[PDB]
């Protein structure tokens, strides 16, 4: 019950934000390719 | 430091936003030859490329400063890709125009609150203060 509340929602909170740094490099290195290069 | 609140009570209530910038004497060595005079009359203006053109002229008083606890900042205190220009005079024969740019400032305003930035026009390091109340290539070339 409460184990399903904790150890799934918090892993989803981990994964949905561990995708963010990948998306951030996807944004910023392509920003370098278009902007200063 | 007093110049910031002076502006915010007299000119900051006439102009919306301000970025408070401190210039080392080594950066001052670019414009002025063989002179170190105090920089009261220095006129900062904005100038933005490729859309429209306008300048707004204002004095921020500069005084030499010992107030940084860091030894390195010992010295004078006064759409990104565009220009600001400081026109500096005294009673004698000395007129200089200095060009500050953006993306040193918006990145630099990130946290004595101080951070080092680089000049594009006349490359040296400048230092930006942040107060607790707070198409590339064609852009320089036109002038």
């Amino acid at each position: 019950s409460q184990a399903s509340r904790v150890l799934s929602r918090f892993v989803s909170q981990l994964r949905r934000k561990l995708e963010r740094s990948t998306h951030r490099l996807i944004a910023d290195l392509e920003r370098l390719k278009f902007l200063y290069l | 430091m007093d110049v910031h609140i002076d502006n915010q009570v007299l000119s900051g209530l006439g102009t919306p936003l301000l970025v408070h910038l401190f210039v080392p004497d080594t950066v001052m060595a670019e414009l002025c030859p063989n002179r170190v005079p105090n920089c009261e009359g220095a006129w900062c203006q904005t100038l933005f490329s490729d859309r429209t053109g306008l300048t707004r002229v204002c004095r921020v008083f500069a005084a030499r400063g010992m107030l940084p606890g860091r030894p390195s900042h010992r010295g004078t205190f006064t759409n990104p890709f565009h220009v600001a220009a400081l026109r500096f005079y005294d009673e004698g024969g000395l007129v200089g125009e200095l060009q500050i740019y953006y993306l040193s400032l918006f990145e630099g305003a990130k946290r004595a609150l101080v951070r080092g930035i680089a000049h594009i026009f006349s490359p040296h390091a400048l230092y930006v203060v942040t107060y607790p109340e707070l198409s590339i290539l064609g852009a320089p070339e036109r002038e």
């Binding site: 409460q2 740094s21 290195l29 200063y36 | 993306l103 594009i120």
Partner: protein, 68 residues
């Protein structure tokens, strides 16, 4: 002498073009150094979010047996 005028313009065109080549390469170098610093700060600035939320997961998981 009218013939030397052209020569003066040719040498001047060479110098004015070289000034732009040198200025453009120097400004590209300095601004690219600045943006490598920027992407460094960017990846650190969301690695902070990663570690704050990891510590949130562990700090609330220590309260799991106080919420069962």
């Amino acid at each position: 002498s009218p013939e030397a005028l052209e020569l003066a313009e040719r040498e001047a065109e060479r110098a004015r073009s070289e000034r732009w080549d040198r200025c453009a390469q120097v400004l590209k170098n300095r601004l690219l150094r600045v943006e490598l610093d920027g992407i460094m700060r960017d990846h650190l600035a969301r690695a902070e979010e990663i570690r704050q939320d990891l510590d949130a997961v562990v700090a609330f998981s220590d309260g799991l047996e106080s919420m069962q």
